[PDB]
Amino acid sequence: GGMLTLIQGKKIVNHLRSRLAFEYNGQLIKILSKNIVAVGSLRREEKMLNDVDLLIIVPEKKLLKHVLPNIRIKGLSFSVKVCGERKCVLFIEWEKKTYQLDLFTALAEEKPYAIFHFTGPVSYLIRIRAALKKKNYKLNQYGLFKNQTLVPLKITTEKELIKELGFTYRIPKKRL
Amino acid sequence: GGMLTLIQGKKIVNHLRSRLAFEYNGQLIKILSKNIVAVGSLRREEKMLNDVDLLIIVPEKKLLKHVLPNIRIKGLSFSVKVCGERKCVLFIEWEKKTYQLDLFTALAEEKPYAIFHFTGPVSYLIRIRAALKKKNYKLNQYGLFKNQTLVPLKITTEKELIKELGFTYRIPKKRL
DNA sequence: CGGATCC
DNA sequence: CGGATCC
Ligand SMILES: Nc1nc(=O)c2ncn([C@H]3C[C@H](O)[C@@H](CO[P@@](=O)([SeH])OP(=O)(O)O)O3)c2[nH]1
Ligand SMILES: [Mg+2]
Ligand SMILES: [Mg+2]
Ligand SMILES: [Mg+2]
Ligand SMILES: [Mg+2]
């Protein structure tokens, strides 16, 4: 897939917001715009993008086997490179050029952890995770853990998570 | 990529044996037939194949960065799905149809370990590796290890390795 | 079972 | 740093 500008990326996401769905035992189920979050370098507002990253919030655990493996995009040509329940990489046709669209799934209880992880950048995550690791924690896209056990934080948003973990909140574009 | 018969697989490999090369800083370097080993289900003589698996023996460590990342196949149309120094998955055109060709690299000192690993089947490797793990060993495609340290076995062929590890030698078709 | 490539 | 999907 080719490289994209920030504006092209934003246009693609806007187009996708009303056109994503999945087939669930023969029933086409629309994915709601409020359950679609732009993540990756697009959310970080980088000028050129290697691809478009979208996080899909899935309301029930039982649906994970169905959402990405039966993804549908109304009116857009695409093919599937790799796909499972948690990551699906698509090549899409947009204005006669091919681009990479990366789809990820999070459960509702994972959402802020997923947003934080998929926003990156990678260097920033490594640093954050290394610091938490010194205190016997493990942070991933699913939660904060200690001794392989979920640490139940009383948080809803990404901003609350970042502050609860003991770090300075920064807007996605200023994370490093 | 589509499914193949064993005889189609054998025909593809035969065709490839004289046509594989890599570009090394602008220089086309032929890969020799003696350094190309059929592995996977093809070596196990299964009647249908999901793909063709080839192991390429690379004579120097410095070449690993060049071989698969600059692979060339004379006269054959192909595209690259994923590729690094150790695994490269290609989709090739053969007669009217697209098939998957999986390429792997081993260094000369790894060869018997690589052949054993890439022959499979997976179930057989799991069983073998589980048994070795009980005795505090780790077996992979690169060597036999204990406490993260290479166990220098005095072996050259796959048959010698299998017997040295304490298992019954079986021909690839009879491994399970 | 264990590793490669990719996110 | 940590995990997904694939070999
Ligand atoms: N240790 C180990 N774990 C695995 O999951 C695994 N998957 C594949 N392989 C090795 C053995 C296979 O014969 C070879 C080629 O990969 P394929 O998926 Se084309 O398997 P095959 O159907 O046997 O041709 O790589 C594996 N080896
Ligand atoms: Mg991206
Ligand atoms: Mg991406
Ligand atoms: Mg195979
Ligand atoms: Mg294969």
The residue ranges of every structural domain in chain B are 4-107, 109-174
Q: Which residue is nearest to nucleotide D4 (CA to C1')?
A: A87
Structure tokens at B104: 């792997």
Establish whether residue B172 lines the binding site of ligand 1, counting it when its CB lies within 6 angstroms of any ligand atom. no
Residue B71 φ then ψ, to 5°:
-60, 145
Q: How far apart are CA A156 and CA B54, in angstroms?
A: 50
Beta pairing class for B97-107 and B52-58:
parallel
How many angstroms separate the CA of B163 from the C1' of C7? 40
Report whether B124 contacts B135 (CB < 8 A).
Answer: no
**Closest among B70, B53, B60 to B16, alpha carbons compared:** B53
Contacts of residue A155, defined as CB under 8 A and 6 or more positions apart, other chains included, come to: A112, A161, A164
**Closest among B69, B68, B75 to B54, alpha carbons compared:** B68
**B83 bridge partner residues:** B88
Residue B131 one-letter amino acid: A
Contacts of residue B109, defined as CB under 8 A and 6 or more positions apart, other chains included, come to: none
Ligand closest to Cα of A44 equals: 2
Atom index in ligand 1 nearest the CA of residue B129 equals 1
Q: How far apart are CA B109 and CA B142, in angstroms?
A: 8
Class of domain A4-106: alpha beta
Q: Which residue is nearest to nucleotide C1 (CA to C1')?
A: B126
How many angstroms separate the CA of A80 from the C1' of C6? 15
Beta pairing class for B52-58 and B78-83:
unpaired
State the nucleotide closest to B69 in CA–C1' terms.
C5
Structure tokens at B91: 């989709």
CA angle B18, B24, B26 (to 5 degrees): 105
Atom index in ligand 1 nearest the CA of residue B125 equals 1
Class of domain B109-174: alpha beta
Contacts of residue A52, defined as CB under 8 A and 6 or more positions apart, other chains included, come to: A4, A9, A12, A13, A38, A40, A42, A99, A100, A101, A102
E-strand ranges in A9-164 read: 20-24, 27-30, 36-39, 48-49, 52-58, 71-73, 78-83, 87-94, 97-107, 138-140, 143-146, 149-150
Q: How far apart are CA A9 and CA A42, in angstroms?
A: 7
Ligand 1 pocket, mutate which of B90, B102, B122 (most atoms under 8 A from CB): B122
Establish whether residue B51 lines the binding site of ligand 1, counting it when its CB lies within 6 angstroms of any ligand atom. yes
Residue B170 one-letter amino acid: R
Closest C-alpha to ligand 1, atom 10: B118
Class of domain B4-107: alpha beta
CA distances to A119, A158, B156 from A39, rounded to whole Å, are 5, 12, 51
| Binding-site annotation: residue ranges of B for Mg(2+) | 51, 53, 102
Q: Is the CB of B16 under 7 A from strand C?
A: no
- Interval between CA B52 and ligand 4 midpoint (Å): 6
When computed from its CA atoms, the radius of gyration of chain A, rounded to whole angstroms, is: 17
3-state DSSP call for residue B165?
Answer: coil
Structure tokens at A67: 């959402």
CA angle B10, B91, B96 (to 5 degrees): 70
Q: How far apart are CA B112 and CA A124, in angstroms?
A: 41
Report whether A68 contacts A86 (CB < 8 A).
Answer: yes
Closest C-alpha to ligand 1, atom 22: B41
Burial of A71 (0-12, 13-18, 19+ CB in 10 A): buried
Other C-beta atoms lying within 10 Å of the C-beta of residue B61: 10
**If you ran DSSP here, which 8-state letter would residue B141 be given?**
S
Residues lying close to strand C (Cβ under 7 A), chosen from 129-148 of chain B, are 129-130, 132-133, 138-142
Closest C-alpha to ligand 1, atom 7: B122
Q: How far apart are CA A122 and CA A118, in angstroms?
A: 9
- Interval between CA B53 and ligand 4 midpoint (Å): 5
